[PDB]
Each structure stands twice: as structure tokens, then as C-alpha cells.
Amino acid sequence: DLLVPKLTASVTDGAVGVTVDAPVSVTAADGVLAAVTMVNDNGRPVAGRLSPDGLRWSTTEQLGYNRRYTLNATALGLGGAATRQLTFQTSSPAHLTMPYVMPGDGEVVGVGEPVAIRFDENIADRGAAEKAIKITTNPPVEGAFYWLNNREVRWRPEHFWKPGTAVDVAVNTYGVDLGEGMFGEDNVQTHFTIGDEVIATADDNTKILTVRVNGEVVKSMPTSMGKDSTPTANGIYIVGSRYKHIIMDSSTYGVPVNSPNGYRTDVDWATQISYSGVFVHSAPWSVGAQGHTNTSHGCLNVSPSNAQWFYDHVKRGDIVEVVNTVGGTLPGIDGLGDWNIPWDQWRAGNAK
């Protein structure tokens, strides 16, 4: 009794809402695939690949949103032939959101650097976004997702990264329903490495900014932080971008320039450590106060040479800690204040 070949697809005829996050495949049993074609509505063929043993065919390029595909396959065996025709329709998004992932590919960053995925649209289903984001670490370490706002989610370990750790971030959002008819416009894939442990502590009691590289004190900077009425917040800051020079505009951070606490200052050697506008930068005008008295709007004022030193030796992801000021604590959702959120609260997340 010779068997008739059987044709099994990873879709079914008449299917709709087929998600394009995965390839479409066809399998033969009691025979081999002699012919497999898939065309879109317009008759344009889709690239596919047949396995050497002739048993498995799969698409090999991206499938498009909002499309009607037609699949034709024929299987031959000693028992005879069999042909099937399947038509199906893929997801038809109401909205598309593009993801952006920091830090940059190939980059080497500090031990406080979180994984950041920012979407250009509000994410209705955060849980679906988190699931779609595949993070790999080496050596392996536990981490968790937490949302700073409706568009950006962060991933980080309980403690600072171990130097030498590889991080791989695969944002596989294409074809994924992120909620309310919003699907990922594309995928992104970044990889980066954890460099040396650089931790700079600013103690308001001593007015000193001590830089420690892998435990070792390598630089001690007299500093002037925020004057009482505009104090520098205590807490953990993540180093962000660095500038040879930059015009600091208080309106950029919510405070009108023409205000009592406003300002517009052109400074040298500026290292940003909070979205709220905290910078380590060159403050020549206050070199007398540094190490003695706080006089700034909130920045860590240091000498020109120490500012340039900081610029040259501190990198994105390195850590600045402020302690014992008269300020409060840096908001966990500052954008660079991730570490100020307790692990239990971060691990619990906020996907809802």
C-alpha cells in the first residue's frame, strides 16, 4: 500500500491576521516537495528555499504587512502526487512604531550603562514589547525591563555590569502586535561591551570629586556643586554625552532663562550626567570656591584641566555618585537616574 504525499504548511488556507514576524514554511510527508511557489497579490514571487532532502521549503526574505499571499506546492511520492493552494492575509497595522536602541553598536561603555529601547510612538502593550526584546549577556547575568515613559524601556542588572561583559540586544519587533493595531516598523540589533569600572564620587562634606578606576583613586577634583537654593541632587548619575564646548540653556531643562534660576552659559569640557541638565564642566570663574563652597545652579564645577581630564577619561555609562548634599535624590526616571530605583521595584517593572 503506497502512500499519497501529504502537504503541511505553517499557515492555513483562508487564514487572516498572519503575523510576519516569522517565515512561512511547507513540509512534505510520504513524498518530497517537487514545486513550491508563493506570490503576493500583484503576482510578484517571494524568495524561498527548499531543503536538500526536498522535505522542507521556507521563505527566506521579509514578508510584508497588509498582503494577500498565495502558496502553491506539489509533492511527489511512490504513492502519487498531491497539490495544495493556500491563500492567506498578513497583519494590517493601524500604526507603525520604529525602535531606537542605545548604546551604539560596537561601542564600549561604562558599568552603569543600561540597554535603552525608545519607540517613536506610545506603546499600548508594554508586555509585548518586552517579550519581543531578546537580550544576551556574557558572562550571563539577570536583568529586568522598566519604563521611564510611554515610549522608552530600560534593561539592566541588579548591580553595575561586570567589566568585560558582552551585551547583545535584539529588538525583534517587526510583525509584532504592540497593542491597538500598532506593529513594529522594523527590527534593530545592537551589541556592546562593558569596559573598566569608572566611579566618580562627589562628597558635599569634602567638596571633592574622587574618580576611582577599578577601585583605584586616580584623580581628586575640588568641585563646587549647587548652592543651597539650587542644590545638586544626591544619588547615582549615569554618564551620557560629552562635549568640548556647549551652550547650556536652562530653558532646555524647563527653567526660563530670564528666571531667577535661569541661565545661558557657554562652557568647556562638559560631561552630561542627567537629562535634568547636570554637567561636570570647566568652571574657571569659581576656581576659588571649588573645594570650599557650592555656587552652581546644580552642575559639578571643576577646574578647566580637571574638566578636560574628565572628558578624556570618563565614558558613556561610567558612574557619578553624589552624596551628602542638601538636595533630594535624583529621580529614577530622569533618563540617566535608572540606578536610583530599588532593584525590587525595577525587577517588578511597570508593563502593567
Ligand X SMILES: *C(=O)CC(=O)[C@@H](C)CC(=O)C(=O)O
Binding residues for Ca(2+): 177, 180-181
**Which residue in the block uniquely carries the three cell numbers 539577570?**
142
Three-state DSSP state, 25: strand
Beta strands in 129-261 (DSSP E): 133-138, 143-147, 152-157, 166-171, 182-184, 188-194, 198-203, 208-213, 216-222, 235-238, 242-249
Give burial (CB, 10 Å; 0-12/13-18/19+) of 244.
exposed
Give burial (CB, 10 Å; 0-12/13-18/19+) of 335.
middle
Give burial (CB, 10 Å; 0-12/13-18/19+) of 59.
buried
6-9 and 143-147 beta bridge pairing? unpaired
Shortest distance, position 119 Cβ to ligand X, whole Å: 29
In the complex with ligand X, the residue whose CB is nearer, 69 or 279, is 279
Catalytic (active site) residue 281: yes
CB atoms within 10 A of CB 252: 12
Shortest distance, position 296 Cβ to ligand X, whole Å: 3
Under the rule (CB under 6 A), what is the footprint of ligand X? 248, 263, 265, 277-279, 283, 286, 295-299, 301
In the complex with ligand X, the residue whose CB is nearer, 86 or 236, is 236
Shortest distance, position 25 Cβ to ligand X, whole Å: 57
Q: Which of 95, 191, 245, 281 is catalytic?
A: 281
Closest by CA to 282, choosing from 221, 202, 217, is: 221
In the complex with ligand X, the residue whose CB is nearer, 296 or 306, is 296
In the complex with ligand X, the residue whose CB is nearer, 156 or 297, is 297
Which segments are annotated as binding site? 177, 180-181, 263, 276-277, 301
Distances from the Cα of 179 to the Cαs of 20, 134, 173, in angstroms? Answer: 15, 19, 12
Shortest distance, position 221 Cβ to ligand X, whole Å: 15
Shortest distance, position 230 Cβ to ligand X, whole Å: 7
Catalytic (active site) residue 299: yes
In the complex with ligand X, the residue whose CB is nearer, 48 or 277, is 277
Q: Which residues are catalytic?
A: 281, 299
